Symmetry: C4
């Protein structure tokens, strides 16, 4: 069906944005008014300490305002702020935006139009951002891994400008896992998805953040690394056993060859035991991985429609 | 008691079966009409992309149809589709069938008749399928393991044609474990079970699927592999300690014997420590295995009847 | 307070006891009638296959019977049968008995009288059973461990004849852990406990059962074995580092001493790394143990009475 | 806002305090009466065996008493007693005090006044207690770690005299984790916190308690130790591989150098494998740590206020 969008909800986490709030609000309001549909704006203050909350309250209390302000008691994180925002939306299309104006609000109409064609998730890709070699390689690896796992590609995973339909948000609200990534979670349930190119501000994370993010993504996406240990251990054990047998055969055939042959055979046995240790660790990982999946308990399926035979 | 069957429910997962749907529906309807009992057919579309959903809807909307069509929003897996089907059945006997017509629908009456004799689970075994040596050995090993664990044998675990009674499905719906195998889960609760031989289409998984399936079955059935590590480590440690003591005794008795005796004693100590490492890993596995069982939280018991003394 | 007992409930698991059921029922009924209090008897059939269920039903339907019969759909275990029995009791004192008549039913009045003095849990100890050396040593070790952990001693943990008050059973019904031991669980919540000596039939487990039972008890009682790994690793690492430093100091002081000194230093470094490995395994165990305790989620406390100040 | 306090609740765990109860009650009552606000006192008996319960009941039943007595069926721990006390409070400011009179009750007015300035958590620091070197170093390390993790410093973590506002207690009641530390849990949710200096009685834990407390704090605060294993393993593997390559290059360039060069190369390979083992253990820890966090399931966020646009 061609179920169209009739209301748009915008979610913007706020944390120490005193300088950028006025222009952000003005541009977002103008962009939303250009849609021709009903709309609302949600501002979530993640425990700011620079008078942002007062500005948000003033904006909410202004005449003819479409802004809903949500105040958290302290800082909890951008992911938690976004999840809190999702719990108070009312429209059928949800859009996430950055409060630093790094992504222009003027792109919202394009996302709305694309979603009106029948897509559940609409993403964005930043053009010619000129990242460093390591960051570009990491982006390529992450895109390939996500495409292989979820079946949907993602050119830019760190981009904040994205659109979701209401059922996607409803299902994502059912996942209580503390460590995750919202764009991956959306694609885990999306049927139809696409991405479009966008531009960005030319000028505006540390390495320690990058390493932790890589670990989080790998743990959220797959458990194969636990499986690779058994393969490595089996290879090592087979090599060690083959060398041990070959040493005895060679000594029995051509007699003694070196003064330290016994040491070499003992080293081969040691390598075999070391490989067995890797096999054991992989065996433990097999259970640990399933424990984790059962613990975080994502939904198994969703039913779209049920057709019963006519009663007559 | 001889509680007989009065309604039969058929569950068939569908995923890109546009070509086989008409003949499948016709033959299944004919077979069900030959029963003489009330019946219904459930078709679950697992996110097909070849117009199967439209055919299913058309079949459901046709006059005098006994077909219930269930549509999923996207692909989730055959196990999830079967579980969704179980949530919408209404009969007291449940039959699972394959949509590729590899197993003929004409065998259903035999399963119904066998179940009418008082069996809770009725299975099937394919005759003279002529599998490869490795697959046959794996089948034998799996059958032996399942027989030892659940107390019920299974000649063919990969066969899809099986019948279950309503209480079995109800109890299986209480298990939320993500990784499992439905036939094993049924036997875990079944009191009386049997299998019968069937024929199959002569002509129509990859090795990577086989290895993962073996791991899944082993993890679902038992935790002994975690126990074997302690035995291995104890054997290694005892051997190493015995060799270390023997070396000292021999040197003290008959004096020096080799130039590298100290190296040999150090290797023996190293082997003892390596065995201790296996013991430690087994110790960790002891807790991990119980954590997993507590996490997946299968039902502990089911009460069939309670008899109170007469009030008078 | 001297809250006395006014009704006694007897729980007896049944599994293939066709021969012993009549005498068991007769003697238990006589013993219960000698109490002078209200009483009931619960018989749980754990999937017997020797006509025990029919005998139990006949006994329940007999005139002036105090027997409640509970039938399970199949075999699940003695622990599960006892837990099912606890879910249907109605008295304020609960007694567990063995259906093989190994423990005479005539001891019940002594347990009732002892419980009437104000004890929550009353146990029994078998006299001069003349067990083997290993079994006696295991019993002593288990008794010491339980006394140290729960604060209550248990001379015989394998004895089935025991008495519990209703609140103890109610709290034990709140623990859903699959692997546990009921007598230990009772003492975990009991305030006042005691044991008394009893006699037993002279004549009537395998080693594999004993080893598994030891592992279950150790895992249910404590997590210290995970802590011992770090101590062992630290000792090994300190020894290795000390030897490595001593070798260098000795060589620098008195010059070269042996041809294989470098090999010895390398072995010392290897031992240090091996100790570090034990430290790491202990570090993992630290988290695993707490995960297990949080998973099995036993109750934290129970409130006996609350006194508010007089409203006036 | 300047929401002031209007009722004060005092929580005091009791365990064998027969001697100190009268003076404690008298001084606490005098201090509370000096506040000028409504107040109540909660006494929790943690299974005492020295007639403390009778004294508490007598105090509760005395005329014009503000004391609520809570009796536990047996001993469960100070943390459990405090949690039980929190479940029965009614005021908007909660104060915890020690029953041994080590911390004078006369400091309560200072805490109330400080909390009236708008603080959520108010702590205390003991001056010139003259602890040993190891204990002082441990205190410094714990303070630094807590400051880095929660963002709030704590000069003395072992001090019992502290004040909390009602929402903090309400959120802490939502955390069911068995192993934790209440002051850290409070700061995890507090927005504004402070500490003040206090005095203490000059004269009145064992080393085994200190080690367990350190492990508990480390496990409750962070998971970095699981991350350090991968770094250590990578360093070891890189060093071993570099040495192995250097040995071959040197031998090919300048020819043979030592009789035991092959042994050295084998040792280098062994070190590389040992480092790989550390990497694998860190890989397992990555999943274990996230499993633990998902298991103990702390609240993700709290909403303070929501402002909707004016309906007109």
């Amino acid at each position: 069906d061609a179920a169209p969008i009739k209301k748009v909800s915008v979610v913007i986490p706020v944390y120490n944005e005193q300088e950028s709030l006025p222009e952000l609000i003005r541009r977002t309001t103008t962009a939303c008014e250009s849609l021709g549909k009903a709309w609302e704006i949600l501002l979530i203050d993640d425990g700011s300490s620079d008078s942002s909350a007062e500005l948000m309250v003033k904006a909410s209390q202004e005449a003819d305002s479409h802004i809903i302000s949500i105040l958290l008691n302290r800082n909890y994180g951008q992911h938690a702020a976004i999840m809190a925002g999702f719990s108070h939306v009312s429209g059928d299309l949800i859009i996430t935006l950055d409060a630093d104006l790094q992504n222009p609000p003027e792109e919202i109409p394009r996302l709305v139009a694309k979603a009106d064609e029948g897509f559940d998730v609409v993403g964005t890709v930043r053009q010619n951002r000129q990242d460093s070699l390591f960051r570009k390689s990491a982006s390529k690896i992450i895109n390939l891994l996500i495409q292989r796992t979820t079946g949907k590609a993602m050119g830019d995973y760190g981009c904040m400008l994205r659109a979701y339909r209401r059922p996607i948000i409803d299902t994502m609200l059912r996942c209580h896992e503390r460590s995750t990534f919202i764009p991956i979670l959306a694609n885990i349930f999306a049927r139809r998805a696409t991405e479009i190119p966008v531009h960005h501000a030319e000028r505006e994370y540390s390495f320690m953040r990058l390493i932790n993010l890589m670990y989080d993504l790998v743990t959220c996406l797959t458990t194969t690394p636990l499986r690779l240990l058994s393969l490595l251990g089996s290879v090592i054990a087979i090599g060690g056993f083959s060398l041990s047998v070959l040493l005895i055969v060679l000594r029995l055939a051509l007699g003694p060859q070196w003064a330290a042959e016994g040491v070499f055979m003992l080293f081969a046995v040691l390598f075999t035991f070391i490989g067995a240790q890797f096999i054991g660790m992989g065996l433990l990982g097999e259970y640990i991985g399933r424990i984790y999946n059962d613990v975080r308990a994502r939904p198994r399926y969703f039913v779209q429609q049920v057709i019963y035979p006519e009663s007559t």
